Amino acid sequence: SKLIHVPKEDNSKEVTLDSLLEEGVLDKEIHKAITRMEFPGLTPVQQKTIKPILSSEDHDVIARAKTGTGKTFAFLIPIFQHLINTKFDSQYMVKAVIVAPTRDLALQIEAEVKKIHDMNYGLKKYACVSLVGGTDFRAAMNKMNKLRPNIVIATPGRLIDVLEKYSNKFFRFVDYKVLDEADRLLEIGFRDDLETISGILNEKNSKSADNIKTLLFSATLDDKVQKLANNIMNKKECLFLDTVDKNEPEAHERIDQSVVISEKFANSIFAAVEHIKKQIKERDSNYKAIIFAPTVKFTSFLCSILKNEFKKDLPILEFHGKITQNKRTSLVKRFKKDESGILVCTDVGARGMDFPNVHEVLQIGVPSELANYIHRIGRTARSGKEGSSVLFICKDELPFVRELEDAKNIVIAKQEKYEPSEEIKSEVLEAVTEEPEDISDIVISLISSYRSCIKEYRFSERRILPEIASTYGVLLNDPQLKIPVSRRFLDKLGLSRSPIGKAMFEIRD
RNA sequence: UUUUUUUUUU
Ligand SMILES: Nc1ncnc2c1ncn2[C@@H]1O[C@H](COP(=O)(O)OP(=O)(O)NP(=O)(O)O)[C@@H](O)[C@H]1O
Ligand SMILES: [Mg+2]
């Protein structure tokens, strides 16, 4: 269908809460709730999207704005207005369905909706319920029945679960569906779930199959995503509201980026330790940082190291998809509040999470996808604030850095080499309590991880994979020792006839 | 010797 570009204008008139009120777009009660938050003004994306989203023109909306610039209220504000506009119609029915790629981002959006509620008790009648995995199903359904929300916030899995059983009871009058982190929800693995979600909401709608308007929001999207959303976009028009220039890099400009290039992968562990050590001394422990790692198992290992080194200076929080949902929520609650600390996580916390006044984002390794470089570093430098990022990689991961220039126009200025001293190696490795069996599982998880992104990051399989596997030897402090495996295991990997496989593993069967 | 997420507490 037709895609109307609305690119960035640098001389247009500043839209405001006051102006939107007097103009007739915003009602007094929603103006009241947002004014009480005391924001200097509305953000560029907020100014650009609120009126169009509410416009009675029959169109979908795509919107791109940078990490930290308030996309959340860019959609929650217009949604509330629509609930006010139609307050007497279908008042016990879900009118807006917000979907997100992680549970913690679903729970964050709900939280923001609750913040709108607490700034105006009048808006509480427009109830909100979150349907996400890891929580009691029955209890959430009790909440749907008792509150009869007009807004649902969800992750795909649990939403499908609920839709297949209660789409008739709550979901026949949905008017808006929002895909936050849209580009991710349309990658393989979520796209089919979204298409099921969209298909059900469309079939079950009481007005028509094309009633629902669709809102796509992300810091990383182009026209390419309008093709992928094709099967879930009903309307004949689609506004593309852009606050970033066509060629301007998507990364937030205020973030001071740098990359530290080690000779081995494992060396990035020592680089990161020395860095955090230097920040704690220099900032007198006034340091809030997020450190990303490629896998659950390596993340867990990384926490052990950082605990041993830094627990006396700072709290170290472990955040990934194998942390139970109760703890995920509570530790997100803490790191939102805390002035200082290190959150160690996978890409579960790459997108959307809003942790105020993070000083630095650190990365050991590459992200799970190219776009996520941008989102990772976007956890810092939010709402006007400053921030730095350091990417810790090895020589063999440099093609990733090049691909950032080629595919995304991201040119990291600050680069430098790193080589660990024997003392840091001793300090870190002697504190490690993991058995060689545990160390194998961790390195093996890294081989798989790096194997997945070879084509995407243009890696040399013959160089990159032996370097990751040699991490096993470095951590046990015997560089020429190889990972003990069976022939049956080597055949699952499809490397029994590969020289690359001879370099990585030793058969100890 | 489940690479990041994502129902199965329906
Ligand atoms: N108009 C505003 N002025 C100043 N701060 C704001 C405004 N709107 C929202 N914020 C705050 O900005 C922070 C980030 O907002 P958020 O909606 O998470 O940005 P975002 O575009 O969704 N970032 P991401 O999803 O990570 O790309 C939140 O803590 C809000 O409280
Ligand atoms: Mg956001």
Side-chain angles (χ1 to χ4, degrees), chain A residues 70-72 75 105 108 180-181 352 382:
Chain A
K71 289 183 284 288
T72 307
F75 62 81
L105 183 56
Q108 177 177 273
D180 200 4
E181 309 299 338
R382 299 175 74 75

Side-chain angles (χ1 to χ4, degrees), chain A residues 39-180:
Chain A
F39 296 137
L42 297 175
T43 69
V45 58
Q46 287 168 0
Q47 291 183 55
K48 193 153 188 169
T49 66
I50 293 166
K51 168 167 176 186
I53 293 160
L54 282 167
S55 182
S56 67
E57 288 161 22
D58 209 10
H59 57 31
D60 296 306
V61 176
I62 305 175
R64 184 176 71 162
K66 301 210 179 202
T67 60
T69 70
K71 289 183 284 288
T72 307
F73 292 132
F75 62 81
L76 283 184
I77 285 171
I79 282 174
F80 266 95
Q81 186 56 44
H82 178 80
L83 303 178
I84 296 168
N85 287 357
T86 65
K87 63 188 288 174
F88 305 110
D89 306 299
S90 315
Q91 64 269 31
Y92 311 119
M93 301 300 175
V94 178
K95 306 198 186 182
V97 173
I98 312 180
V99 182
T102 79
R103 297 160 174 185
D104 316 290
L105 183 56
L107 296 176
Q108 177 177 273
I109 299 160
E110 186 187 23
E112 296 299 309
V113 162
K114 298 211 193 189
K115 282 174 195 177
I116 290 177
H117 286 168
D118 271 303
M119 295 297 104
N120 187 351
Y121 296 170
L123 296 172
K124 279 167 166 283
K125 55 159 60 177
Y126 309 122
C128 174
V129 175
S130 64
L131 306 172
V132 303
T135 63
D136 190 340
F137 191 99
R138 186 176 44 83
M141 222 56 57
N142 287 348
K143 200 165 180 285
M144 291 284 293
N145 288 299
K146 176 188 166 192
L147 300 185
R148 302 297 316 209
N150 303 119
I151 303 182
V152 153
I153 318 208
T155 38
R158 176 64 68 86
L159 180 50
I160 288 178
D161 194 9
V162 174
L163 280 185
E164 291 176 324
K165 305 154 188 73
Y166 308 99
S167 62
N168 273 348
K169 183 154 179 179
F170 306 97
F171 295 87
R172 301 161 57 231
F173 305 88
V174 167
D175 283 311
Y176 283 93
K177 80 177 172 279
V178 170
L179 283 72
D180 200 4

Side-chain angles (χ1 to χ4, degrees), chain A residues 21 66 414 438 452:
Chain A
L21 179 58
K66 301 210 179 202
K414 291 181 177 182
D438 301 326
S452 144

Side-chain angles (χ1 to χ4, degrees), chain A residues 334-354:
Chain A
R334 166 164 186 178
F335 193 70
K336 276 176 181 289
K337 287 200 293 179
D338 285 359
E339 69 275 16
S340 60
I342 303 174
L343 181 69
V344 184
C345 61
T346 51
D347 273 12
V348 67
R351 282 177 177 264
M353 293 324 288
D354 175 60

Side-chain angles (χ1 to χ4, degrees), chain A residues 87-206 208-223 225 228-235 237-245 247-280 282-296:
Chain A
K87 63 188 288 174
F88 305 110
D89 306 299
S90 315
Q91 64 269 31
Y92 311 119
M93 301 300 175
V94 178
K95 306 198 186 182
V97 173
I98 312 180
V99 182
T102 79
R103 297 160 174 185
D104 316 290
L105 183 56
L107 296 176
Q108 177 177 273
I109 299 160
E110 186 187 23
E112 296 299 309
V113 162
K114 298 211 193 189
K115 282 174 195 177
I116 290 177
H117 286 168
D118 271 303
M119 295 297 104
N120 187 351
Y121 296 170
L123 296 172
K124 279 167 166 283
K125 55 159 60 177
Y126 309 122
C128 174
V129 175
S130 64
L131 306 172
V132 303
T135 63
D136 190 340
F137 191 99
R138 186 176 44 83
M141 222 56 57
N142 287 348
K143 200 165 180 285
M144 291 284 293
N145 288 299
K146 176 188 166 192
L147 300 185
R148 302 297 316 209
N150 303 119
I151 303 182
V152 153
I153 318 208
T155 38
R158 176 64 68 86
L159 180 50
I160 288 178
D161 194 9
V162 174
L163 280 185
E164 291 176 324
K165 305 154 188 73
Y166 308 99
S167 62
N168 273 348
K169 183 154 179 179
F170 306 97
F171 295 87
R172 301 161 57 231
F173 305 88
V174 167
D175 283 311
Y176 283 93
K177 80 177 172 279
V178 170
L179 283 72
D180 200 4
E181 309 299 338
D183 61 312
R184 177 77 184 86
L185 292 168
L186 296 176
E187 294 188 327
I188 300 297
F190 280 134
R191 189 183 162 192
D192 276 1
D193 286 356
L194 262 293
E195 282 179 13
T196 301
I197 287 159
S198 177
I200 291 182
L201 296 179
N202 276 1
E203 157 163 315
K204 300 267 176 267
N205 196 264
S206 58
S208 60
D210 74 328
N211 185 54
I212 290 159
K213 284 180 190 185
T214 295
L215 307 184
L216 309 193
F217 275 92
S218 183
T220 45
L221 52 70
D222 55 348
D223 299 357
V225 312
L228 289 166
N230 190 25
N231 295 328
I232 70 158
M233 307 273 260
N234 300 331
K235 308 307 190 172
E237 283 188 324
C238 195
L239 271 57
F240 195 133
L241 303 181
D242 214 329
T243 63
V244 188
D245 290 319
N247 287 146
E248 172 184 340
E250 278 153 338
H252 199 264
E253 60 269 20
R254 208 180 305 113
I255 298 170
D256 180 77
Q257 296 173 66
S258 77
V259 51
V260 172
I261 304 154
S262 282
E263 217 87 86
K264 294 191 72 53
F265 173 81
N267 287 5
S268 300
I269 294 176
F270 307 120
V273 170
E274 286 202 287
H275 186 88
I276 291 165
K277 183 173 297 213
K278 186 176 185 168
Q279 294 296 320
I280 287 166
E282 282 186 345
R283 308 168 177 272
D284 194 26
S285 314
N286 307 319
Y287 185 54
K288 199 185 184 179
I290 303 178
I291 180 168
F292 293 101
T295 73
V296 171

